């Protein structure tokens with residue numbers, strides 16, 4: 217299913233630098249919150265969209281394929297998704 | 306067994322700050338290599354000694370029992386142990 221522990225640690229080790237607190241320090245309005253994603257994430261607010269962006273990157277956001285493994289990409293995507301849907305940031 | 310992927314991400318998120326590359330930026334000779342640990346780690350170079358220090362801390366090194374859960378502690382201890390034994394640092 218979803219290893220949110222692996223998710224959280226992967227998030228801290230690789231994403232926190234630009235997305236601490238569910239925010240976006242590079243492009244301020246493209247945060248990791250539900251609303252923002254529903255509006256800016258290509259593919260919609262769903263696990264598929266998040267995973268695809270993590271794998272391939274987007275603009276100033278780097279690609280994580282070949283850096284993270286599918287388990288790590290999957291867990292971090294679930295973590296981001298769960299934090300967002302639950303308003304947990 | 307302890308998941309080494311979780312171990313790697315836990316190490317990066319929480320330990321890399323002072324132990325990047327298996328080194329020690331605070332007390333230079335107290336590195337994460339087998340020899341160093343054989344000499345300085347209470348209990349000698351073994352998985353259990355590593356786990357105990359991570360849980361409890363030592364001097365300037367903080368304790369992690371609050372910050373990390375048992376699976377993350379077990380995983381990071383295994384990762385550090387495997388890196389040192391294979392001289393992978």
Ligand code: HEM
Pocket residue numbers: 227230231232233234235240242243245246247248249252253256257258266269270274275276277278280292293296
């Ligand atoms: C870590 C592996 C990581 C994750 C997870 C992550 C997620 C992510 C999402 C879901 C978005 C979409 C948000 C939205 O409202 O559309 C997104 C967007 C951007 N990110 Fe990211 N991101 C991760 C890592 C990083 C890192 C390391 C940086 C900084 C160098 C970063 C930056 C950005 C930027 C910029 C965007 C917007 C991309 C665009 O639409 O142009 N992310 N990220």
Ligand code: HEM
Pocket residue numbers: 315316319320321322323324329331332334335336337338341342345346347355358359363364365366367369381382385
């Ligand atoms: C992350 C959770 C983490 C781990 C793993 C870790 C391991 C570790 C070991 C096994 C030793 C012993 C090395 C030896 O040769 O004896 C050790 C020692 C020290 N560490 Fe550490 N460490 C982790 C995290 C941190 C962090 C974030 C810092 C810096 C703030 C830090 C620093 C130190 C220091 C200093 C020591 C020496 C302790 C002493 O004997 O006086 N560690 N670490």
